[PDB]
Design a protein around this ligand. Structure first.
Ligand SMILES: *[C@@H]1O[C@H](CO)[C@@H](O[C@@H]2O[C@H](CO)[C@@H](O[C@@H]3O[C@H](CO[C@H]4O[C@H](CO)[C@@H](O)[C@H](O[C@H]5O[C@H](CO)[C@@H](O)[C@H](O)[C@@H]5O[C@H]5O[C@H](CO)[C@@H](O)[C@H](O)[C@@H]5O)[C@@H]4O)[C@@H](O)[C@H](O[C@H]4O[C@H](CO)[C@@H](O)[C@H](O)[C@@H]4O[C@H]4O[C@H](CO)[C@@H](O)[C@H](O)[C@@H]4O)[C@@H]3O)[C@H](O)[C@H]2NC(C)=O)[C@H](O)[C@H]1NC(C)=O
Ligand SMILES: Cc1nnn(Cc2cc(C(F)(F)F)ccc2/C=C/C(=O)N2C[C@@H]3CN(C(=O)c4ccc(S(N)(=O)=O)cc4F)C[C@H]3C2)n1
Ligand SMILES: [Ca+2]
Ligand SMILES: [Ca+2]
Ligand SMILES: [Cl-]
Ligand SMILES: [K+]
Ligand code: NA
Ligand SMILES: [Zn+2]
Length: 805
């Protein structure tokens, strides 16, 4: 109940929200059906429209008008945004040359430049180039300010997850808004776009920017707008708040537009009907900038123009139906559309089996336009599994397609020509970023970055300490003229041991054999120097990784590679090696095929054994440094050390062997040498973080050798590819992957074919940032380079996406 008979007199768009049943006058009252009776009359005035005209100049103030053109309007802060243009011969902001804003030029009483976030729903990245003729105000912000060619949204590329990610710096799995539609089984409650459940505070985790600001003494405008408040009114409201007295005036504001998304759904991303929505958005920006200029705030405010996701072509005919695959289709609940999430219709049905559902959906039609996954098997780059609101079974849908349960769903719900929600690497899902103001750089283009990073920067813009989040703070310092955040590298927690030769061959009873009993003073000092680290500067180019947790490990040096060997996990945490452009691939010689050699630096007690692998009918082994790339027949013996061995399913060995035999050499030839760091990852609880030993769910049968869930590689070279990787004077280039360590290749529908037809495609799917690997291993890479730390942070957040232009 709301006692709707209080009044909004003097209260219009109040910043503090009042408690039921006292009636509300805030920008969300409409959404709750709680506005006072006179809200429309007093707060949503429309009389005479939104622009001054020649005859309205110097009028007698009429309080009924939507905005004002009387002499006193500037001091009242409620002029139409074109007042000075029409009535005082001023130029529109867009018609002024741009001029570097070196320092904030603010009215007296401003403690810090205000931040205005101008957010646009569905604004695809290519609209900046493709709509440029019709968006002069936006183009001026873009060319005069700082801009990225695009900004990567989070998955799923829907509105609710992405706007809340912008607000919090968190992945959807951590903030809890994991789709536009959700069932939380602990609450037994559903979140929907239409309706009231979504207003309950229990859905919304982390700490959004407006709360971070308020907790630290920085006042915030209310971020959310009721759909029926027109855009012109939202802008006028912001401009009115900017005219408040110093003690009342917010420092951070958001505008939100439902366009161009609303139209993109109806007409597709480039429908001819899309020109008008873009024009209209540009006019809104024009009104804000003209309004700021009137208040002498146009060289004081930092403006961020940002989208939540892009828009793809999708029609009703491009729908796959689960009824074409599943006999039991009525025992499931599907969250449908541009992703799928499946659970049991009833938790009382004991005959429901996710294993048989996955199998019935796997590689069943030649051109199948979705791929099923257990959520823990989704590419790690999506960070989309550690939340009870995410269903165990997930369908990754091809761009341009929909999934639905039954045909009746689609025609008893062609309406739409656009949609979004697909994998966040998809080019059509990319969105925009422009920053303009005293704190942003002047006429600067920056590389593409992920929207998880912006919370930190918005905190920096407002002098706030960010709540803990998934950004890497400092990785976007290159956007900023000042207020940069200068982090220190994390402190190493565990130092390595450097073991020498301490064990005799005969102390090892591992059930391993090697054909190697084949016998010089020139070449004996040589192998000794290699074991003491004499080639370490060739294979460990950026320093050894730092171990950021408590553990026992050894550094092992070799001619061709260096490793950090874990005594707890009985394998390397990392293995580092450089392959020059000139390097030769050799084969594993016949006598060495099943060779595993004891490592005399490492106790039998801290070693793997061959017998465990023989006994484990499911599990085989591979090597982290590939024997194929040994520098010499003598150096090849090192690659067969039991300390270079890791557990591998035979199906995974197909993948790994092709990467090591073919792909590494290929990249070295293309990139002018590469440095490779490879290793295992253990993430049995799918939280994106390194497991402790007591989290491991699988061991090689009858041993304490833990089985990795994934294998990573980080492949680094010179950005200037005219310089070899080992003699690089400037910025670096990286690509990485986190491959799932799976006992089958069901993920790859063409896997019966030659590895040259499917392996590289799999690797591309599981592309990763270095930072993803850091979270998953507790390691910190690139500790010793000549480069600035912020530059290295940017490098660690880089994702190689394998999408064309
Ligand atoms: C992305 O960045 C984020 C933010 O930094 C990273 O997320 C953090 O990860 C930490 C490690 O997993 C985690 O720390 C835990 O905090 C627990 C206290 O939690 C509450 O308080 C915080 C602070 O206010 C709050 O943010 C939390 O909010 C979460 O949960 C609510 C539900 O109430 C949601 O509304 C909200 O969306 C958010 O959900 C997410 O996090 C939880 C886990 O916390 C997930 O389950 C959800 O799916 C969702 O993703 C909380 O309200 C604290 O209890 C934990 O301590 C246990 O574990 C340690 C290990 O050190 C152990 O020593 C302790 O004894 C303790 O164990 C005991 O409890 C166990 C569980 O019941 C039990 O098994 C044991 O036997 C013990 O008795 C832990 O310290 C932190 O909360 C989150 N924060 C957020 C916001 O998500 C994230 O890791 C980054 N991602 C990547 C890939 O890097
Ligand atoms: C969600 C959410 N989380 N946090 N916010 C507040 C917010 C943050 C930021 C920013 F960038 F600064 F973080 C900027 C602006 C804001 C403020 C935003 C705001 O007033 N809204 C966003 C809501 C979305 N909405 C819909 O009905 C809707 C649902 C789905 C789709 S779809 N098909 O595209 O998926 C489109 C839609 F329009 C009601 C809008 C009112 N909204
Ligand atoms: Ca949206
Ligand atoms: Ca984990
Ligand atoms: Cl959803
Ligand atoms: K075996
Ligand atoms: Na297959
Ligand atoms: Zn949409």
């Amino acid at each position: 109940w709301t006692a709707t008979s209080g009044s909004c007199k003097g209260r219009c768009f109040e910043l503090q929200e009042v408690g039921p049943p006292d009636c509300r006058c805030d920008n969300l009252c409409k959404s709750y059906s709680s506005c006072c009776h006179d809200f429309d009359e007093l707060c949503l005035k429309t009389a005479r429209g939104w622009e001054c005209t020649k005859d309205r100049c110097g009028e007698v103030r009429n309080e009924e008008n939507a905005c004002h053109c009387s002499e006193d309007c500037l001091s009242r802060g409620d002029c139409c945004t074109n007042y000075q243009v029409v009535c005082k011969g001023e130029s529109h902001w867009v018609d002024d040359d741009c001029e570097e804003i070196k320092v904030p030029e603010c009215p007296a009483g401003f403690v810090r430049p205000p931040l205005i976030i101008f957010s646009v729903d569905g604004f695809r990245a290519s609209y900046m180039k493709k709509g440029s003729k019709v968006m002069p105000n936006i183009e001026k912000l873009r060319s005069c300010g700082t801009h990225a060619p695009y900004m990567r949204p989070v998955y799923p590329t829907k509105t609710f997850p992405n706007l809340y990610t912008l607000a919090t710096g968190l992945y959807p799995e951590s903030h809890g808004i994991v789709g536009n539609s959700m069932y939380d089984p602990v609450f037994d409650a559903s979140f929907h776009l239409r309706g009231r459940e979504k207003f309950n505070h229990r859905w919304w985790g982390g700490q959004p920017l407006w709360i971070t600001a308020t907790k630290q003494g920085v006042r915030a405008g209310t971020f959310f707008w009721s759909v029926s408040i027109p855009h012109e009114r939202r802008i006028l409201t912001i401009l009115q708040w900017l005219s408040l007295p110093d003690n009342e005036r917010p420092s951070v504001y958001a505008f939100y537009s439902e366009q161009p998304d609303f139209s993109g759904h109806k007409y597709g991303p480039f429908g001819p009907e899309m020109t008008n929505p873009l024009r209209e958005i540009d006019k809104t920006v024009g009104q804000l900038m003209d309004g700021l200029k009137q208040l002498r705030l146009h060289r004081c405010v930092n403006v961020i123009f940002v989208g939540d996701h892009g828009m793809e072509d999708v029609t009703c005919d491009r729908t796959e139906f689960l009824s074409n695959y599943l006999t039991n289709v009525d025992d499931i609940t599907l969250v449908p559309g541009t992703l799928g999430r499946i659970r049991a219709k009833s938790i009382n049905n004991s005959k429901y089996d996710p294993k048989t559902i996955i199998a019935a959906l796997t590689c069943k039609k030649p051109d199948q336009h979705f791929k099923p996954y257990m959520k823990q098997h989704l590419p790690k780059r999506l960070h989309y599994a550690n939340n009870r609101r995410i269903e165990d079974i997930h369908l990754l849908v091809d761009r341009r397609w929909h999934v639905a349960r039954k045909p009746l769903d689609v025609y008893k719900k062609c309406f739409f020509q656009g949609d979004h929600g697909f994998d966040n690497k998809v080019n059509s899902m990319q969105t925009v970023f422009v920053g303009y103001g005293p704190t942003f750089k002047y006429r600067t283009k920056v590389p593409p970055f992920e929207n998880i990073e912006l919370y930190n920067v918005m905190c920096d813009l407002l002098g706030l300490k960010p709540a803990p989040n998934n950004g890497t703070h400092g990785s976007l310092n290159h956007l900023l003229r000042t207020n940069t955040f200068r982090p220190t590298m994390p402190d190493e927690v565990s130092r390595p041991n450097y073991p020498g030769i301490m064990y005799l061959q005969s102390e090892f009873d591992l059930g391993c054999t090697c054909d190697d009993k084949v016998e010089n003073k020139l070449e004996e000092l040589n192998k000794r120097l290699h074991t003491k680290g004499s080639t370490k500067e060739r294979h460990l180019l950026y320093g050894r990784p730092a171990v950021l947790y408590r553990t026992s490990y050894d550094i092992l040096y070799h001619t061709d590679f260096e490793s950090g060997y874990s005594e707890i996990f009985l394998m390397p945490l990392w293995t580092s090696y450089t392959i020059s452009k000139q390097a030769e691939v050799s084969s594993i010689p016949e006598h060495l095929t099943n060779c595993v050699r004891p490592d005399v630096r490492v106790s039998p007690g801290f070693s793997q054994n061959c017998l465990a692998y023989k006994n484990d009918k499911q599990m085989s082994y591979g090597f982290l440094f590939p024997p194929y790339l040994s520098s010499s027949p003598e150096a090849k013996y090192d690659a067969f050390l039991v300390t270079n061995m890791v557990p591998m399913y035979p199906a995974f060995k197909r993948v790994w062997a092709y990467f090591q035999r073919v792909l590494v050499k290929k990249y070295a030839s293309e990139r002018n040498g590469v440095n490779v760091i490879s290793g295992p990852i253990f993430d049995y609880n799918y939280d994106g973080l390194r497991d402790t030993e007591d989290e491991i769910k699988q061991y090689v049968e009858g041993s304490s050798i833990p089985v990795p869930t994934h294998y990573y590689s980080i492949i680094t070279s010179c950005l200037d590819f005219t310089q070899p990787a080992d003699k690089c004077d400037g910025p670096l280039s990286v690509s990485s992957f986190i491959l799932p360590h799976r006992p089958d290749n069901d993920e790859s529908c063409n896997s019966s074919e030659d590895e040259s037809k499917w392996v590289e495609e799999l690797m591309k799917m599981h592309t990763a940032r270095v930072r993803d690997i850091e979270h998953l291993t507790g390691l910190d890479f690139y500790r010793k380079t000549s480069r600035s730390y912020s530059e290295i942070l940017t490098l660690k957040t880089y994702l190689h996406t394998y999408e064309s232009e």
